[PDB]
Amino acid sequence: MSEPIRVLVTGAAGQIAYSLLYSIGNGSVFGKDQPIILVLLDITPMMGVLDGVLMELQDCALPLLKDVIATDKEDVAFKDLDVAILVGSMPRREGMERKDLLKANVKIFKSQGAALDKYAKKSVKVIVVGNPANTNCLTASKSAPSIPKENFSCLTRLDHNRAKAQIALKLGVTANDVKNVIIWGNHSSTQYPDVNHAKVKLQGKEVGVYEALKDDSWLKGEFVTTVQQRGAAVIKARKLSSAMSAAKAICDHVRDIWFGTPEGEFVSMGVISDGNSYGVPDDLLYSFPVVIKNKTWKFVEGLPINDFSREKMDLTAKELTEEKESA
Amino acid sequence: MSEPIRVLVTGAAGQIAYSLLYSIGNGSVFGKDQPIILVLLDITPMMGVLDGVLMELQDCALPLLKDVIATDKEDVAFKDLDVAILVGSMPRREGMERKDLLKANVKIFKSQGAALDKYAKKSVKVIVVGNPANTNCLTASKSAPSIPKENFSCLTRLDHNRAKAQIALKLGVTANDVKNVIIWGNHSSTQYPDVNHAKVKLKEVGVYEALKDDSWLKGEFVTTVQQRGAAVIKARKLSSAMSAAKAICDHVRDIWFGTPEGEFVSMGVISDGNSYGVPDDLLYSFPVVIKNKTWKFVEGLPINDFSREKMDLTAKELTEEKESAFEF
Questions:
Q1: Which residues form a coiled coil (chain A)?
Q2: Nearest CA in chain B to A58
Q3: What is the 3-state secondary structure (H, E, C) of A197-260?
Q4: Nearest-CA residue of chain B relative to A164?
Q5: Which of residues 206-245 of B touch A (CB under 8 A)?
Q6: Backbone angles phi, psi at A105, to 5 degrees
Q7: Domain boundaries in chain B?
Q8: Which of A7, A250, B286, B313 would be A83's cystine partner, CB 3.0–4.6 Å?
Q9: SS3 B68
Q10: How far, in Å, are A120, A212, B151, B279, B296 from residue B272 at the CA level?
């Protein structure tokens, strides 16, 4: 390629980044002909771990990895970025309530937004992973007034992929046989996994998921509940939070930005809500169904919203409005 | 699509496997048109973590992953296998005498060899990763008399890839531009990282001639590669799973699809009939070319005096290991 792109991953000594870096370095995200300068940020006490991660990346003998830089300083980390994957955040520990998790992280993302605004390229694409994702993204965006608001997205693709898998498992097909599920709203308990516009190929024929299942109460109750609580279920089994599947979801999310959404499909992404036609307040970071071409996302327009869907999309909008006011 | 192949990964609840399963599931090891039935084996205490691993594999929404089976039973794990990746072994607890460790691992791999011998396809490819890789692989091979000995291999590709990375680093070139490094012999400690037959494009020139620093290549390069895994563990304090999993993928891919034209790779294989003065009936890393899923020795490579000593010393380590373990 003409030039390597500089891709920053924060929280780079942690578990999600450990499952993500190889896929970036080996060409599976940005393309088999795209060299990459990988920039890794984490806190100062983690710099020794991060030198070990540099050693492993070296020992993968990846031809596209032109350089890997480890740092604990924002000026180094955010310099001339083409992509910023914001994984680092403060975790919710025992004893702290949801308000405290929000308070802890607002300062982190206001600072990374300021660094983006001062050091990165104005064309940088910023994908926000660390929780609370949507509000962390909004905070950073507001602190980066020189970077176009459309360049900020937050990760609902993990919830999206989980919704797909539950449908595929119930109906007995592969993941690629399901498409156009939607995660509306907050990456949180109030997310709405919507399948009113989803399709599945069943006997060579594409059918709606509602029609295919003949079980509306499952789709409107237990299905929603399973996708919302999936993260806690994984934590309960392996005593750690998801890392492999979260990294795979980041790869999907960034790849669809870089290359575009597949023909006939749209995907779930947290984006700035300004101008949406679905009754969602403006100036929220909210997950919508989008299509992507030339690295520019676009709302999927004209989807019919029934009354069950209306109630769910409004409840998640309310929670996001309340998180914003806390910040 | 091809019919599904059944692929086992043992130690499936551990760190290396956690970094490996995605690459198998997403098609990058066995091909984008090859559906996979992924069989995961670990010890009963790990079954709870293993079910969370299974949940994450579902949550990747992988079209090629036809099914995922998680189990602690050999008769389930080894049925009708096309590939078995034996990652799990007994790790050495602090203050464990090596007699007890050799007995624990002989027991594991005798059992798994017997399960291969009774339940798997006779065409199964077996790749041994868990330490001590070479002797564990030999144990399983001898415990599986009906499986062709050539179907067994053990992982030296991690040290092979590390060697390639150090050469490219020292010559200021990209990883794609070095080929034909060799790891001879044992998987750890005494492994001989040999670049006497390696090429680098600057166009194509021998590495010794390109670098013009015989003592670094015979000294610091060798100890850097031999000690690289201990250096990563010191820094990360945890596994070296990301690069070990990449190496496993490279190793299995090169079995499945073959080595590129003009290139060989490093693989622990049964030493029978080699022409390099290595004892027979050893599992020993050699340079190999692979076609139609069948490896063959790269023959006739000139062995200088320095290389002969390095290859004999690692042969001696393996011989002593084999005698010690087979007392069990």
A1: none
A2: B165
A3: CCEEECCCCEEEHHHHHCCHHHHHCHHHHHHHCHHHHHHHHHCCCCCHHHHHHHHHHHHHHHHC
A4: B61
A5: 228, 231-237, 240-243, 245
A6: -95, -25
A7: 1-154, 155-328
A8: A7
A9: strand
A10: 59, 59, 13, 8, 11
